Amino acid sequence: YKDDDDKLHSQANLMRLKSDLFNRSPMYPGPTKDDPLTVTLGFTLQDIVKADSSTNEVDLVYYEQQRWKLNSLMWDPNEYGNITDFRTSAADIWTPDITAYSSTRPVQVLSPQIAVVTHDGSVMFIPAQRLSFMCDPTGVDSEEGATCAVKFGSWVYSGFEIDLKTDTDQVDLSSYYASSKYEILSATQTRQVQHYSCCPEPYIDVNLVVKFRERR
Amino acid sequence: DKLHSQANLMRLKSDLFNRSPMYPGPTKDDPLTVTLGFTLQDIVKADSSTNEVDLVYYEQQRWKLNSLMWDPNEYGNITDFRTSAADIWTPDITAYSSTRPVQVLSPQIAVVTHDGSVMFIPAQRLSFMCDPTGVDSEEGATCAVKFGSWVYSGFEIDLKTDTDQVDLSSYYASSKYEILSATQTRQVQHYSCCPEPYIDVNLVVKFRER
Amino acid sequence: DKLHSQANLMRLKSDLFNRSPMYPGPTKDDPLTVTLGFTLQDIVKADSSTNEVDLVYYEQQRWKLNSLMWDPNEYGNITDFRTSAADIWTPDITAYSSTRPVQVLSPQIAVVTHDGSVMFIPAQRLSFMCDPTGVDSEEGATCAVKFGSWVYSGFEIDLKTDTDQVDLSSYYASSKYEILSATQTRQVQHYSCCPEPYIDVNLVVKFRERR
Amino acid sequence: DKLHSQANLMRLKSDLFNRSPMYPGPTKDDPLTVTLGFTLQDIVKADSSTNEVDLVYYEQQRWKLNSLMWDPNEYGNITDFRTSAADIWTPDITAYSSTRPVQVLSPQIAVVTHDGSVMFIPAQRLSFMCDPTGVDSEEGATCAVKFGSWVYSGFEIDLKTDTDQVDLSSYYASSKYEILSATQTRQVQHYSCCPEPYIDVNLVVKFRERR
Amino acid sequence: DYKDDDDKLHSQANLMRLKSDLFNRSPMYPGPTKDDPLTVTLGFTLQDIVKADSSTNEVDLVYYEQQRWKLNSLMWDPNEYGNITDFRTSAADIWTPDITAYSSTRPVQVLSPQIAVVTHDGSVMFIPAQRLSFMCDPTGVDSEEGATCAVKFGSWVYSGFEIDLKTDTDQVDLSSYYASSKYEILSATQTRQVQHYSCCPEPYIDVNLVVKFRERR
Numbered sequence A: 001y002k003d004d005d006d007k008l009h010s011q012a013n014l015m016r017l018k019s020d021l022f023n024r025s026p027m028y029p030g031p032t033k034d035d036p037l038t039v040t041l042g043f044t045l046q047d048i049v050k051a052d053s054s055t056n057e058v059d060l061v062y063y064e065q066q067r068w069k070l071n072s073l074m075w076d077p078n079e080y081g082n083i084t085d086f087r088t089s090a091a092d093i094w095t096p097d098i099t100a101y102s103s104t105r106p107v108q109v110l111s112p113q114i115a116v117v118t119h120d121g122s123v124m125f126i127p128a129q130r131l132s133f134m135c136d137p138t139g140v141d142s143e144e145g146a147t148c149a150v151k152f153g154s155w156v157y158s159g160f161e162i163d164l165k166t167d168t169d170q171v172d173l174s175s176y177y178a179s180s181k182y183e184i185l186s187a188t189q190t191r192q193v194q195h196y197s198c199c200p201e202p203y204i205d206v207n208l209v210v211k212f213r214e215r216r
Numbered sequence B: 001d002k003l004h005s006q007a008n009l010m011r012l013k014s015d016l017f018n019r020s021p022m023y024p025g026p027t028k029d030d031p032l033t034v035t036l037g038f039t040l041q042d043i044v045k046a047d048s049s050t051n052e053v054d055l056v057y058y059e060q061q062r063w064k065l066n067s068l069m070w071d072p073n074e075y076g077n078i079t080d081f082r083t084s085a086a087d088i089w090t091p092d093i094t095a096y097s098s099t100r101p102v103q104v105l106s107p108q109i110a111v112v113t114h115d116g117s118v119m120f121i122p123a124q125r126l127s128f129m130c131d132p133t134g135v136d137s138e139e140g141a142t143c144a145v146k147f148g149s150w151v152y153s154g155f156e157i158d159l160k161t162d163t164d165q166v167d168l169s170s171y172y173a174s175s176k177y178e179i180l181s182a183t184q185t186r187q188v189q190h191y192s193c194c195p196e197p198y199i200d201v202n203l204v205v206k207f208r209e210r
Numbered sequence C, D: 001d002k003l004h005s006q007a008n009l010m011r012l013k014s015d016l017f018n019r020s021p022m023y024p025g026p027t028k029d030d031p032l033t034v035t036l037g038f039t040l041q042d043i044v045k046a047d048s049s050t051n052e053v054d055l056v057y058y059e060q061q062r063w064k065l066n067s068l069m070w071d072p073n074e075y076g077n078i079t080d081f082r083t084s085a086a087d088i089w090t091p092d093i094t095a096y097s098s099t100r101p102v103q104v105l106s107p108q109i110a111v112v113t114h115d116g117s118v119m120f121i122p123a124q125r126l127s128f129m130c131d132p133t134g135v136d137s138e139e140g141a142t143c144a145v146k147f148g149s150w151v152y153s154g155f156e157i158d159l160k161t162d163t164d165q166v167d168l169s170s171y172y173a174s175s176k177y178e179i180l181s182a183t184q185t186r187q188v189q190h191y192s193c194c195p196e197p198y199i200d201v202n203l204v205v206k207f208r209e210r211r
Numbered sequence E: 001d002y003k004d005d006d007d008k009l010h011s012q013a014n015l016m017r018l019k020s021d022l023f024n025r026s027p028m029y030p031g032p033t034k035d036d037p038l039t040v041t042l043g044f045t046l047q048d049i050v051k052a053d054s055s056t057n058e059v060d061l062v063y064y065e066q067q068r069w070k071l072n073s074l075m076w077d078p079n080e081y082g083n084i085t086d087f088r089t090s091a092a093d094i095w096t097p098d099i100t101a102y103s104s105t106r107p108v109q110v111l112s113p114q115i116a117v118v119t120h121d122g123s124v125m126f127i128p129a130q131r132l133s134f135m136c137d138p139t140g141v142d143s144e145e146g147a148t149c150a151v152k153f154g155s156w157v158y159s160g161f162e163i164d165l166k167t168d169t170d171q172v173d174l175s176s177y178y179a180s181s182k183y184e185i186l187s188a189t190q191t192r193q194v195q196h197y198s199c200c201p202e203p204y205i206d207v208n209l210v211v212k213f214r215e216r217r
């Protein structure tokens, strides 16, 4: 019965932490110019599924890793039975509105929408996705291959509210499907800055550039 | 000071969304101006077996409400915020000759500024009625589709444009189809049945195989 | 004025939707007339490998409730308003021979007038059962699909039309298919089991491949 | 008096839905009979590259609950009403060998009668596992799909039919496929693990390409 | 105290009281933790290989995915509730494990009612029927040796110190396999694998579904 109570007790601690973080205190309304947020973005490309030259659409399957850190999600694990992290439904917390800028169909989510929250206040959210986007696969049947590119970024926040960044410019290809119809020649993920004439604030995206060819 | 910034935004939003009778939509005594514009990104597909064409575009919608106005001084110099499109009233702007339900490609979030203006820009994929005959020639094909309120007249939603030129500066350079022109013309009509004006925006695209 | 216009509208909605009972649907003692009409916009596709045809149309539905009545004088001269179709009772009018769920193309919003009348006009894409044999001939193909209430007899929902001619004034001029005729005929059926009449509107379209 | 018929119905629905315990599902001590019947409307598609066939049918389901009975004399002679299927318990009848989620074609509304019986007739399009080999010959193709509760044994839901003949009186006369026969046969099975009987209805359809 | 007062009540009455006590009253289960890990047993019953697309290297499978776990917070004494030993609940009204195909190419399509069976020992049985498109090269399907493909299933967000994924057998149940499928199964195995990463001390668990198949002659 001791072990049963320890288990009951760890649950009570997890619920106390969640109740402290989500119900007792005000939650996150989203970033502002006086409280900007850094979102780190990374791609793990799994498969090029289809390259359609009649419409110039290509379909990719990838994991999109999103990470940010909030003071409001920080806690001392000592105040909560040494809990260092927990899980939560992505709908229960603020998440950044990162979107592909040149999709041709709504993105299809392939993983459960659950985020990992760590005691330093960092949130990790890794939606697995199938995306159709604009791409001319001319060259795919040659040694040089085809090249396509799609930009990801916030829909409604500038770089003074959400600063987007990558930890590396190299797309993780260590999970790329070895028997895909297409082989990857290179895949890069590059933070780009753009300014509009109207406006002094920078606008940021991460450009996913994939060079690929028919596997032979 | 980051604490106070967040506190000010939370206060602004509860003041506007919880402590105030929120906008129930327009009336004939209280008409709303809605300004509409298109940024055409791609002609994805032109199907000659069914005469349907598929477009991807950003549809910019703007309107302004007194109920969404505030003084940035009372709220730590906050001049704008974001809200879910589901949490505010949005206009019922619809394509009149779509052949499939529109597919939304962007997060359904609007930008509200302190002057009460709301900007909502859904990226959409639309299939609509279009005969692509001529697309494989130099002159190209021409198609058209009207957008407007489904249930409000021009005395209720005053639908306007800022320009008759569709923005082509985001158009995909390697589309199967090149754009010869794209216009967005406001049409104000009076039908014999009724005294109210009815307004639509007629999107006309002339295009050909690249 | 504009703060009073909005105040009265919100007050009218409150009085209809929160301070009297909402409509539980028709009964044999309190039957409801529903008037139905079609505006055919396009025959998108005719599939001879499965005998399905796809139409796009606007389906106009009209009914009238004493519980949606008001005196405009008591509400600042407001003579109509709009409501989500989810927030009111609507009639269960269904195609009887569809092959895929109907796809709705228009915002699901209804128009309520002070006389209690409701107007609801969904734009729809429908796939239904149809053999398009003859479509590539001068005589063309002919198909038909019935619409009616799924669960109410004619003693509970009295289905009517205003005309037996489908409105073809919005028909897409450059469709793959040219319309030869489109009619919408009220039909009354009687089953031997049952004294009550069963009503449908039979949409019959004759069409052929354009020239 | 039409305000009184409306009020009587609201009073009936309040008494049944809000002022007594709603039905939580069957139990071993109190099992429920569910009667199932098919009305086959169309074979839309037979796909010999994946061995899937698509059917449109009406699936009639009927059960009876003490908790839904009333005396019509206590409620202005109301003998039946309609309810959204979402607002009452419904049985978990499932095709066991579908290959795509079922697609519902009719409004999800049930008919409740004063004896407590509930009638629910969803129209559905179903893709299921079927080898159409022979469909282009005179003897035709034969396929079968079982239906039953996903989670209740025969000691909890006693599944029955009224007839082993599938109703073909609404079958589309201009389908690509004609029906040679269609039967719905109650089957009882036991598993080594367990004493309870498990019940299904085997829908067996023989069909061929129409001439 | 005796446990006789419940015997006088309708079985439905007792069922509603049981659900009420477990769901409405008990603060429910926040999911597993390192201090309170959960065992989840996973098993597959393969019903059909519907489609093998050599133009995209996607294969479509239909199968029943059996999931079983046991929670203390869902235990009860049948003697307090008219000898009710089990009940059904919407899968949306309880916690369920986040078991995910790792190499799907389309969202899974659910083919059965999302209802779970809860037994008085606290065990939950949940068996969604599913259609899955996943990454698979079917080259060789038109030969005697056939094609081989694999797809791993596991928790998306929990390590092996939080959800221990188990199997009852490494044999995929083929006793419901569609006898007239376009494809015949040569073999089908489900192997629990433990993965260790350079970065991290926690083990990670998946079940690898490996199917060898060919076109039925």
Ligand SMILES: C=C1CCCC2=NC[C@H](C)[C@@H](C)C[C@@]23CCC(C(=O)O)=C[C@@H]3[C@@H]2O[C@]3(C[C@H]4CCC[C@@]5(CC[C@@]6(O[C@@H](CC[C@@]6(C)O)C1)O5)O4)C[C@@H](C)[C@@H](O)[C@H]2O3
Pocket (backbone or CB within 6 Å): A101, A153, A154, A155, A156, A157, A158, A196, A198, A199, A203, B039, B058, B060, B111, B119, B120, B121, B167, B169, B170
């Ligand atoms: C909802 C929106 C923008 C949605 C469309 C886009 N969103 C991501 C960011 C903010 C844009 C810079 C890019 C854009 C998506 C991708 C894109 C392209 O690839 O060409 C163009 C998008 C851009 O977005 C607007 C107005 C945007 C440009 C930057 C300055 C500004 C002015 C205020 C501001 O308004 C926007 C949000 C941020 C804010 C408040 O600073 C309003 O941005 O307008 C409008 C589009 C129709 C398109 O023409 C292009 O211009």
Ligand SMILES: C=C1CCCC2=NC[C@H](C)[C@@H](C)C[C@@]23CCC(C(=O)O)=C[C@@H]3[C@@H]2O[C@]3(C[C@H]4CCC[C@@]5(CC[C@@]6(O[C@@H](CC[C@@]6(C)O)C1)O5)O4)C[C@@H](C)[C@@H](O)[C@H]2O3
Pocket (backbone or CB within 6 Å): B096, B148, B149, B150, B151, B152, B153, B191, B193, B194, B198, C039, C058, C060, C111, C119, C120, C121, C167, C169, C170
């Ligand atoms: C829900 C509706 C109309 C939905 C269909 C359309 N909506 C947008 C506006 C209001 C119409 C002028 C156009 C219409 C869509 C496009 C269209 C076409 O391209 O041909 C025809 C649409 C029109 O809409 C009605 C009645 C509409 C015409 C204008 C006057 C009026 C009378 C009252 C009013 O009712 C309508 C709303 C506005 C209101 C209250 O002022 C009822 O409009 O009826 C009904 C359709 C079936 C179609 O025949 C055509 O006629």
Ligand SMILES: C=C1CCCC2=NC[C@H](C)[C@@H](C)C[C@@]23CCC(C(=O)O)=C[C@@H]3[C@@H]2O[C@]3(C[C@H]4CCC[C@@]5(CC[C@@]6(O[C@@H](CC[C@@]6(C)O)C1)O5)O4)C[C@@H](C)[C@@H](O)[C@H]2O3
Pocket (backbone or CB within 6 Å): C096, C148, C149, C150, C151, C152, C153, C191, C194, C198, D039, D058, D060, D111, D119, D120, D121, D167, D169, D170
């Ligand atoms: C939910 C339902 C019926 C759903 C299916 C249909 N609904 C619309 C009306 C009520 C039917 C006459 C037609 C029917 C749809 C179209 C159709 C066909 O094209 O063949 C057949 C539908 C019919 O509907 C039933 C029982 C219906 C026939 C008329 C008398 C009656 C008996 C009571 C009653 O029950 C029905 C509702 C009305 C009610 C209460 O008066 C039960 O209707 O049963 C059941 C079907 C399986 C089919 O065989 C055919 O018979």
Ligand SMILES: C=C1CCCC2=NC[C@H](C)[C@@H](C)C[C@@]23CCC(C(=O)O)=C[C@@H]3[C@@H]2O[C@]3(C[C@H]4CCC[C@@]5(CC[C@@]6(O[C@@H](CC[C@@]6(C)O)C1)O5)O4)C[C@@H](C)[C@@H](O)[C@H]2O3
Pocket (backbone or CB within 6 Å): D096, D148, D149, D150, D151, D152, D153, D191, D193, D194, D196, D198, E045, E064, E066, E117, E125, E126, E127, E173, E175, E176
């Ligand atoms: C959710 C479920 C079963 C879902 C799958 C099926 N459901 C309908 C009924 C109950 C089964 C007899 C058939 C089955 C669907 C069709 C099918 C087939 O055609 O092969 C096999 C289904 C069966 O269902 C299990 C365990 C089922 C068989 C009978 C006894 C029992 C033991 C307890 C019990 O658990 C089940 C519910 C009923 C209950 C509580 O009495 C657990 O059923 O387990 C599990 C499947 C993987 C499959 O192998 C086959 O065996």
Ligand SMILES: C=C1CCCC2=NC[C@H](C)[C@@H](C)C[C@@]23CCC(C(=O)O)=C[C@@H]3[C@@H]2O[C@]3(C[C@H]4CCC[C@@]5(CC[C@@]6(O[C@@H](CC[C@@]6(C)O)C1)O5)O4)C[C@@H](C)[C@@H](O)[C@H]2O3
Pocket (backbone or CB within 6 Å): A044, A063, A065, A116, A124, A125, A126, A172, A174, A175, E102, E154, E155, E156, E157, E158, E159, E197, E199, E200, E202, E204
């Ligand atoms: C949401 C996630 C991971 C989602 C992706 C995957 N989830 C299931 C488990 C946890 C992974 C080991 C596998 C992985 C799916 C399958 C897969 C593959 O087949 O290659 C790779 C997935 C993996 O998951 C990450 C970070 C994962 C590796 C193990 C250690 C760690 C660090 C903390 C932790 O973070 C993850 C949850 C568990 C936790 C908190 O312990 C964060 O796991 O990161 C992230 C992916 C982009 C991919 O590169 C690969 O690496």
Ligand SMILES: [Ca+2]
Pocket (backbone or CB within 6 Å): C169, C170
């Ligand atoms: Ca007209």
Ligand SMILES: [Ca+2]
Pocket (backbone or CB within 6 Å): E003, E004, E005, E006, E007, E078, E079, E080, E081, E082, E083
């Ligand atoms: Ca007892």
Ligand SMILES: [Cl-]
Pocket (backbone or CB within 6 Å): B191
């Ligand atoms: Cl008109």
